[PDB]
Short mmCIF file of all heavy atoms in Angstrom, two decimals:
data_model
loop_
_atom_site.label_atom_id
_atom_site.label_comp_id
_atom_site.label_asym_id
_atom_site.label_seq_id
_atom_site.Cartn_x
_atom_site.Cartn_y
_atom_site.Cartn_z
N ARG A 802 2.76 35.04 -33.42
CA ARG A 802 1.86 34.42 -32.50
C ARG A 802 2.56 34.07 -31.17
O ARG A 802 2.08 34.45 -30.09
CB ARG A 802 1.29 33.17 -33.16
CG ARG A 802 0.63 32.17 -32.19
CD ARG A 802 -0.65 32.69 -31.57
NE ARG A 802 -1.49 32.67 -32.74
CZ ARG A 802 -2.52 31.88 -32.98
NH1 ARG A 802 -3.04 31.07 -32.06
NH2 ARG A 802 -3.04 32.01 -34.16
N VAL A 803 3.67 33.31 -31.22
CA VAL A 803 4.28 32.92 -29.95
C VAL A 803 4.81 34.12 -29.16
O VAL A 803 4.80 34.11 -27.93
CB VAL A 803 5.33 31.82 -30.12
CG1 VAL A 803 4.68 30.60 -30.73
CG2 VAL A 803 6.52 32.27 -30.96
N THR A 804 5.21 35.18 -29.86
CA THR A 804 5.84 36.33 -29.22
C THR A 804 4.76 37.10 -28.43
O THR A 804 4.96 37.52 -27.29
CB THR A 804 6.46 37.28 -30.28
OG1 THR A 804 7.58 36.69 -30.95
CG2 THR A 804 6.91 38.55 -29.72
N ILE A 805 3.60 37.27 -29.06
CA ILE A 805 2.45 37.86 -28.38
C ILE A 805 1.94 36.98 -27.24
O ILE A 805 1.62 37.50 -26.19
CB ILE A 805 1.29 38.10 -29.38
CG1 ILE A 805 1.68 39.15 -30.43
CG2 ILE A 805 0.03 38.52 -28.66
CD1 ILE A 805 2.23 40.47 -29.89
N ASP A 806 1.83 35.67 -27.45
CA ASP A 806 1.29 34.81 -26.39
C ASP A 806 2.14 34.92 -25.11
O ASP A 806 1.60 34.85 -24.01
CB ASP A 806 1.28 33.34 -26.78
CG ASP A 806 0.21 33.02 -27.82
OD1 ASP A 806 -0.64 33.89 -28.13
OD2 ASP A 806 0.22 31.91 -28.34
N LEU A 807 3.46 35.04 -25.24
CA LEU A 807 4.29 35.06 -24.04
C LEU A 807 3.95 36.34 -23.27
O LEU A 807 3.73 36.30 -22.05
CB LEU A 807 5.75 34.95 -24.41
CG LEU A 807 6.62 35.00 -23.16
CD1 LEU A 807 7.89 34.22 -23.41
CD2 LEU A 807 7.02 36.43 -22.80
N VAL A 808 3.88 37.46 -23.98
CA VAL A 808 3.50 38.77 -23.35
C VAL A 808 2.11 38.74 -22.74
O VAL A 808 1.89 39.25 -21.66
CB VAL A 808 3.63 39.92 -24.34
CG1 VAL A 808 3.35 41.23 -23.65
CG2 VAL A 808 5.04 39.94 -24.93
N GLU A 809 1.19 38.04 -23.39
CA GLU A 809 -0.15 37.92 -22.84
C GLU A 809 -0.20 37.10 -21.53
O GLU A 809 -0.89 37.49 -20.58
CB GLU A 809 -1.08 37.34 -23.90
CG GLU A 809 -2.52 37.45 -23.50
CD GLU A 809 -3.50 36.91 -24.55
OE1 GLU A 809 -3.12 36.43 -25.63
OE2 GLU A 809 -4.71 36.95 -24.30
N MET A 810 0.58 36.02 -21.46
CA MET A 810 0.73 35.22 -20.22
C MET A 810 1.29 36.09 -19.10
O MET A 810 0.80 36.05 -17.95
CB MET A 810 1.63 33.99 -20.49
CG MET A 810 2.03 33.16 -19.29
SD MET A 810 3.53 33.81 -18.55
CE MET A 810 4.78 33.35 -19.75
N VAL A 811 2.22 36.97 -19.45
CA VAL A 811 2.80 37.85 -18.45
C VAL A 811 1.80 38.88 -17.93
O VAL A 811 1.72 39.08 -16.73
CB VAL A 811 4.11 38.49 -18.94
CG1 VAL A 811 4.64 39.51 -17.93
CG2 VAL A 811 5.16 37.40 -19.10
N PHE A 812 1.06 39.53 -18.82
CA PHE A 812 -0.05 40.36 -18.39
C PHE A 812 -1.04 39.59 -17.47
O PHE A 812 -1.50 40.10 -16.48
CB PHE A 812 -0.79 40.96 -19.58
CG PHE A 812 -0.13 42.16 -20.13
CD1 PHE A 812 0.21 42.24 -21.46
CD2 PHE A 812 0.14 43.26 -19.30
CE1 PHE A 812 0.78 43.41 -21.97
CE2 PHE A 812 0.69 44.42 -19.81
CZ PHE A 812 1.02 44.50 -21.15
N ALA A 813 -1.33 38.35 -17.77
CA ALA A 813 -2.23 37.58 -16.88
C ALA A 813 -1.62 37.40 -15.47
O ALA A 813 -2.32 37.19 -14.50
CB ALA A 813 -2.53 36.22 -17.52
N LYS A 814 -0.30 37.42 -15.35
CA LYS A 814 0.36 37.33 -14.05
C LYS A 814 0.56 38.73 -13.44
O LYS A 814 1.16 38.86 -12.40
CB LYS A 814 1.72 36.63 -14.21
CG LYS A 814 1.62 35.16 -14.66
CD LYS A 814 2.97 34.55 -14.83
CE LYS A 814 2.81 33.08 -15.09
NZ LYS A 814 4.18 32.54 -15.33
N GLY A 815 0.05 39.77 -14.08
CA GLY A 815 0.25 41.12 -13.61
C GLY A 815 -0.91 41.65 -12.80
O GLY A 815 -2.02 41.19 -12.95
N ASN A 816 -0.65 42.64 -11.93
CA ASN A 816 -1.73 43.32 -11.26
C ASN A 816 -1.38 44.72 -10.85
O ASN A 816 -0.59 44.91 -9.88
CB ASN A 816 -2.13 42.54 -10.05
CG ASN A 816 -3.17 43.27 -9.25
OD1 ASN A 816 -3.63 44.38 -9.62
ND2 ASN A 816 -3.56 42.67 -8.16
N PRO A 817 -1.93 45.73 -11.57
CA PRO A 817 -1.38 47.08 -11.40
C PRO A 817 -1.77 47.70 -10.05
O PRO A 817 -1.16 48.66 -9.65
CB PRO A 817 -1.88 47.87 -12.64
CG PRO A 817 -2.51 46.83 -13.52
CD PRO A 817 -2.91 45.69 -12.65
N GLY A 818 -2.76 47.12 -9.38
CA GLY A 818 -3.04 47.36 -7.95
C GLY A 818 -1.90 47.08 -6.98
O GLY A 818 -1.72 47.82 -6.02
N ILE A 819 -1.06 46.10 -7.27
CA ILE A 819 0.05 45.80 -6.42
C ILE A 819 1.10 46.83 -6.67
O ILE A 819 1.66 47.50 -5.68
CB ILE A 819 0.62 44.39 -6.65
CG1 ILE A 819 -0.41 43.37 -6.35
CG2 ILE A 819 1.80 44.16 -5.74
CD1 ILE A 819 -1.00 43.50 -4.97
N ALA A 820 1.35 47.09 -7.93
CA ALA A 820 2.32 48.20 -8.22
C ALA A 820 1.88 49.53 -7.66
O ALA A 820 2.73 50.32 -7.19
CB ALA A 820 2.53 48.35 -9.70
N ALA A 821 0.57 49.81 -7.72
CA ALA A 821 0.06 51.07 -7.16
C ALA A 821 0.29 51.10 -5.65
O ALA A 821 0.61 52.13 -5.08
CB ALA A 821 -1.44 51.31 -7.49
N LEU A 822 0.11 49.95 -5.01
CA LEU A 822 0.28 49.90 -3.57
C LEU A 822 1.75 50.15 -3.20
O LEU A 822 2.05 50.92 -2.31
CB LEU A 822 -0.27 48.60 -3.02
CG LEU A 822 0.14 48.21 -1.62
CD1 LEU A 822 -0.54 49.14 -0.61
CD2 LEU A 822 -0.28 46.80 -1.31
#
Side-chain angles (χ1 to χ4, degrees):
Chain A
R802 163 69 69 112
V803 300
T804 292
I805 295 308
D806 288 351
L807 179 151
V808 184
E809 192 178 1
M810 172 273 288
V811 175
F812 279 126
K814 295 178 173 177
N816 175 2
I819 298 305
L822 165 71

